Every structure is written in structure tokens, then in C-alpha cells.
Amino acid sequence: LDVLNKKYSLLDHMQAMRRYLLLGQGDFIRHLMDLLKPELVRPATTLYQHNLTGILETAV
């Protein structure tokens, strides 16, 4: 239970999962879906993750 949090991380990653994966971080998604609003409608059908990651970093 120490090395899961002092070499690996667990309780901080649970906090991060509630933030992002469970949408609880009211800052990030609240403007991701502003910048990504064009891409949420636009069907760029094989614009895979490597073209979809740069929008993540500018949203941050």
C-alpha cells in the first residue's frame, strides 16, 4: 500500500480518473468542448488519434 502510492501511484490516479474519465474536473472538459466543437460535428472519418491529440494539448 506504500509503493502503490510512493513508487507507483494509485489514490492520486483515482483522483485523476474521477476528474477526467468521470468528467468531474469542471475546468478541462468545459473548454475542450469549445475548441473541439468543430471536430465534434465534422466527420473526418479516418482522422485517427495522431491528428486528434494536438487539440488536447491546446485545450490544456
Binding site: 479516418t46 485517427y48 495522431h50 491528428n51
Partner: protein, 638 residues
């Protein structure tokens, strides 16, 4: 038995060819194997009174047993010649009364158990069998004494009349067990032919097997505590120093005489994995967890000996052996974490691997472009001649001249740059006259400290990377020349120049800002974070492969139309400079070139986009192309 001749005679050569023959391994004279007076059960009247007094017959077979138990004839009981099979048989007198005869047969297996270990101790002393098999045969002598001592006192008792065959059957019982625990170990080394460090595996397994048995387990723990001492005595030398004193060849590591005059500077192939090699039969079955650490430790210290003089061990306390405990595991850890760090420091403090790498990047990866706007401007007119028409010392002196006015003239290892030539040209990847630009390369000399990093398997790729990069540098210079030589100032040639230029100048801008400088910074942090030279060699190799694969190269067909783009570009510049020389220093022959090259180039450039699109990062290639003002969108897509 009589196979022992051949069995030693093959072993002789197995030791003696692998152990370099400046002095022979010793051997005992021919009497030591001949003479029966060393063995147990020495070798080439009864008188029964109608077998009348029964108490007498007991004393008689006790009396004889007290000889037979130490390997001597009786005169009722005896021993048979047939030591040719792996265990002895005893005659008993066929008139000896039943029940007595059965009790005799019940105790006799300790005699044969003794017999087989007298011969084991005798034979496996000999200098063929490596150091371990000796120290095993040595430790066992103690228990022959104890057996002999026992049998003495019982005969002394028998002379008083105070000992009976039923009492002998009681007193013998610890011997019955403790000889069989040994005889069943001897035959396992005979048949196993563990005639090297591998016999420790047989002892460690047998030791763990008796974990239930205490009174038998200590006898086995004694033997492995003893017989392992010679083996560990070598292992200490190998882990604490770059040193290998094996007088046969039985240790887990072995050495080969690899870096002889055939290869100074490692000339493309297979250094480390031949120089020192783990002999997989000869690991004692309780070291595998860090057998690679063992090999790596001594490899590293032996390089420090040869390059950096020190043979100073870290601690060099004894790797004593005991079951279950982890002292030797941690000692080999400490020795590894020492030896690795020391060789790293020797690679990284002076002659320092980084500084060498920094000079390489300025020349092959070309980040000191200052260098070449001289060098190739000097060397170009010499390089317009074909191959075998070139003066190499003239070229070498032109190097070491651009390298004078250039900022490059500040580096301590700049003198290691050599001009070499590749034949085969960029056609290399699976006529002779087109040369110069097609055939030129740099090279670096290396030295035994750094050759284990920067040898030909690396530098051949640094050349290939340089070759591709120097090529585009050349044609781009020819292309921009067509502006200054133009100053009728015909517009079609001028716009077609701009388009060809923004192709070749942008493949230029990619490779070094998208591949080289990024992956190089990543390399720099990787080397700075590496703990030993196996890690560093990996980081360097992976960096180099990354930079190679992402700069068009390693495409299954050279992304072939790229070679064509380069070819039409050069010929376009060649004809344009010839025409503009001619037109003022005809246009009907020229417009043909303008038309056919706008056509050919459009075809080859849109082919390039079509051929790359399979890979869809790598998508950056279109990003300075499809940026503004498109001519790529002359293609309605796919």
C-alpha cells in the same frame, strides 16, 4: 571400470585444447590407476565341522564381516570379482545356516556402499576432472575414516566375546544410512558426467531433496559447503576482477582470443557476444537469476583493465555458500553495481563518449552547416569528375581547410574526420561513372575505449544518413543558383523554380527539426539517465534507428519516386543553367523543357503524395506543403 581409460583419454583433450597449451595440465603416473592396494575390496579355506556349533558360526560370520565391511575377504563370506557392473556382489558360504545367512545379506549392502565410494574417492582425485570433482572426493575421506574407526572398535569388542551379530545389526545403522547417502551420490556423478561446475547442481538438488531428513541433510550440506569452495574461488576472481584463472574450462564464463590483428576497431561484426560467453552446461543450477550480471560484471572490469589500468576490486569478501540465504545474491549485486558504474565513469569522465558524439553530430548530421558552405564550394569542381578520376590527398587537404575558417576549427577531435568513398551510391538499398556527389562520405577513427560504442555498425548508418542529407544540400544549392544566373527573365522558369525549391527546401526543413534535433535531445536525456553501458548502447542504437527510418529511408521501394524527384530536379537545374548560359552568354528548344518538366514534376510530386498516403508525426510531410496558396490541390484526392 575398464572404460576409465577412454573416459579419461577423451577428457584429456577436452581440457587441453581449450586450456591454452603453454604448460600441460599435470597427470598421475600409470601405477596410480594400476595398483589394487589403494582400493577397497582387495582382489586377485572355510573348514566347517559339519557346521555343528551354531554360536560358533555367528562369531565366525561376525569375524569375517569385520573384514568384509572394510573391503577384505573373509573365509566364509567373501566378495565377487564383478566390479564391472556399477555395484558389487558378495558370495556367502552356501553351507551357512539360514536365518544367519539372511541377517548377513541384510547388513552386507553397507559393504558394497563403502566399496563404491573408495573407488570414487580414489579415481576422481585425478587432474583431468576439474577442481570441483577433486574437492568433492576430498570431503568424503572423512567418512571413510569414521567407518574404519567404527569397524576397529567392534573387532576389539569381538575379541572380548561381548559382541553378537544382532548387536552388530544395531550398531551399524547410522553407517547404513550415511554410506548410502554417498554411494547414491557418487554414481550420479559417474553417469551424469558432471565433470565440471555442473556437479554443484547435483549436490544442490540432492541437498534440497533431503530438507525433510536432518541427520541426512547435514551430511549433504557438508559436501556442498566443501566441494563448492574451488568453484567460488574462481567466481570471486571473475566478479571482483576482470580476471579468469580457470586451469581447465569448468567455470560458467569462457573467453575467446577475438580482438587479434584481424579486427582492431571492430570492423562491422560481433564483438561482445564472442569475446566472453556463458557455457550453459556449466551453471550450477542456483545462479541463473544473475548469470547475466556475472558475465556483465567481469566483461566490464576486463575492459577497464585493458583501457583504464585499474584492477581494484569493490570489497572482495568471500561468496561463501549456504542454503536459502541471499548473501551471494547481494554480493554479486554490489559487484555488478560497482563494475557497471566504474566502466561508465571510465566511458563518461574522460575520452568522454558525449564529447565524441557532439563532434559527430556537427559533421554527419550536419548541424554545423557553416562547415559545408565552404567545404563543398571548395570541393565541388573536383567532385565533378567521375570515380577513379579523383585526387584523395587533394580532397583531404581541402578538408582541414574549410575546417580552418569554419567554426568547426574549435573541437579537440576534429582531426578524426577522414574523407572516404562509397561505391554502389544511393542505389545501395536492396554504370559507375556518375560520381562525386553520388560517391562521397566522411568517416571517423575509433580506439578500444570507444570502439565498443561508435564502430562500423553505427557509423555505416551515420554515413547513410549523411549521404541522403548531403545530396539534398547539393541539389538545393544548384537550384538557388538559377536565380542569380537569370537576373529575357522568363517567368515560367522562375515560378517553376519556386515550386521545385519549396519541395526540396521543405523536405530539408523536416528531417533535422522533426527527426534529428528532437530524437537527439531525447537521446541526450537517455544517455544522461542510463546507469550502465548496455543501456547506453541501446539508447544510441534506438536513436540511430529512429532517425534512419523516419527520413524516407527503409521504405520498401525507396519511396521510389523520391529518387526520381531528385533526378528531375538536378536535370532541370542542369538544363536551365545551360539554357540561360546559352540564351545571352534557343527558346523553341527550351519551352520543351519548361513544359515536360512542369509535367514530369507534377506527376512525380503527386505520385510522392499518393505513395506516402498509405502511412497517413509522419503526417507532418504535407503540413508545410498544404499550408497556403496550394498547388498540391491541383490533385483532386485519391
Amino acid at each position: 571400470l575398464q572404460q576409465s581409460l577412454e573416459l579419461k583419454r577423451k577428457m584429456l583433450r577436452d581440457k587441453q585444447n581449450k586450456k591454452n597449451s603453454g604448460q600441460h595440465l599435470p597427470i598421475f603416473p600409470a601405477w596410480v590407476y594400476e595398483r589394487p592396494a589403494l582400493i577397497g575390496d582387495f582382489l586377485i579355506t572355510a573348514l566347517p565341522i559339519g557346521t555343528l556349533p551354531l554360536a560358533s558360526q555367528e562369531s565366525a560370520v561376525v569375524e569375517d564381516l569385520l573384514y568384509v565391511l572394510v573391503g577384505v575377504d573373509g573365509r566364509y563370506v567373501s566378495a565377487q570379482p564383478l566390479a564391472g557392473r556399477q555395484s558389487r556382489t558378495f558370495l556367502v558360504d552356501p553351507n551357512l545356516d539360514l536365518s544367519i545367512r539372511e541377517l548377513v545379506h541384510r547388513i552386507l549392502p553397507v559393504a558394497a556402499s563403502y566399496s563404491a565410494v573408495t573407488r570414487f574417492i580414489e579415481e576422481k582425485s585425478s587432474f583431468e576432472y576439474g577442481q570441483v570433482n577433486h574437492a568433492l572426493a576430498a570431503a568424503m575421506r572423512t567418512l571413510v575414516k569414521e567407518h574404519l574407526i567404527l569397524v576397529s572398535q567392534l573387532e576389539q569388542l569381538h575379541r572380548q566375546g561381548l559382541l553378537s551379530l544382532q548387536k552388530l545389526w544395531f550398531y551399524i545403522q547410522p553407517a547404513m544410512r550415511t554410506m548410502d547417502i554417498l554411494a547414491s551420490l557418487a554414481t550420479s556423478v559417474d553417469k551424469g558426467e558432471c565433470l565440471g561446475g555442473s556437479t554443484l547442481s547435483l549436490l544442490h538438488d540432492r541437498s534440497f531433496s533431503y530438507t525433510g531428513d536432518s541427520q541426512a541433510q547435514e551430511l549433504c550440506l557438508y559436501l556442498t559447503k566443501a566441494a563448492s569452495a574451488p568453484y567460488f574461488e574462481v567466481l570471486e576472481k571473475w566478479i571482483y576482477r576482470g580476471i579468469i584463472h580457470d586451469p581447465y574450462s569448468e567455470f560458467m564464463v569462457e573467453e575467446h582470443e577475438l580482438r587479434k590483428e584481424r579486427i582492431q576497431e571492430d570492423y562491422n561484426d560481433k564483438y561482445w557476444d564472442q569475446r566472453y560467453t556463458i557455457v550453459q552446461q556449466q551453471i550450477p543450477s542456483f545462479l541463473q537469476k544473475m548469470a547475466d550480471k556475472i558475465l556483465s560484471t567481469g566483461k566490464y572490469l576486463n575492459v577497464v583493465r585493458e583501457c583504464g589500468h585499474d584492477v581494484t576490486c569493490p570489497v572482495a569478501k568471500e561468496i561463501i555458500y549456504t542454503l536459502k540465504e541471499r548473501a551471494y545474491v547481494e554480493q554479486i549485486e554490489k559487484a555488478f553495481n560497482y563494475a557497471s558504474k566504474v566502466l561508465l565513469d571510465f566511458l563518461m569522465e574522460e575520452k568522454e563518449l558525449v564529447a565524441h558524439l557532439r563532434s559527430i553530430k556537427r559533421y554527419f548530421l550536419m548541424d554545423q552547416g557553416d562547415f559545408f558552405v565552404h567545404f563543398m564550394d571548395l570541393a565541388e569542381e573536383e567532385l565533378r569528375k567521375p570515380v577513379e578520376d579523383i585526387t584523395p590527398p587533394r580532397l583531404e587537404a581541402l578538408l582541414e581547410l574549410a575546417l580552418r575558417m569554419s567554426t568547426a576549427n574549435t573541437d579537440p577531435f576534429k582531426d578524426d574526420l577522414k574523407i572516404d568513398l562509397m561505391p554502389h551510391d544511393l542505389i545501395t538499398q536492396l554504370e559507375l561513372a556518375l560520381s562525386g556527389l553520388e560517391a562521397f562520405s566522411f568517416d571517423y577513427i575509433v580506439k578500444w575505449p570507444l570502439s565498443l560504442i561508435i564502430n562500423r555498425k553505427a557509423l555505416t548508418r551515420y554515413q547513410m544518413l549523411f549521404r541522403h542529407m548531403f545530396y539534398c544540400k547539393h541539389v538545393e544549392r544548384q537550384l538557388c543558383s538559377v536565380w542569380i544566373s537569370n537576373k529575357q527573365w522568363f517567368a515560367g522558369a522562375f515560378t517553376l523554380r519556386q515550386r521545385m525549391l519549396n519541395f526540396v527546401q521543405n523536405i530539408q526543413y523536416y528531417m533535422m527539426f522533426e527527426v534529428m534535433e528532437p530524437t537527439w535531445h531525447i537521446l541526450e536525456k537517455n544517455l544522461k539517465s542510463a546507469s550502465n553501458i548496455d543501456d547506453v548502447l541501446g539508447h544510441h542504437t534506438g536513436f540511430l534507428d529512429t532517425c534512419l527510418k523516419d527520413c524516407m529511408l527503409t521504405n520498401p521501394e525507396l519511396l521510389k519516386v523520391f529518387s526520381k524527384l531528385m533526378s528531375v530536379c538536378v536535370m532541370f537545374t542542369n538544363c536551365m543553367q545551360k539554357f540561360t548560359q546559352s540564351m545571352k552568354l534557343l527558346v523553341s528548344g527550351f519551352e520543351a523543357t519548361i513544359n515536360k518538366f512542369d509535367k514530369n514534376f507534377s506527376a512525380h510530386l503527386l505520385d510522392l503524395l499518393a505513395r506516402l498516403s498509405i502511412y497517413s508525426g509522419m503526417a507532418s510531410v504535407i503540413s508545410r506543403l498544404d499550408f497556403n496558396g496550394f498547388y498540391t490541390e491541383r490533385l483532386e484526392r485519391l
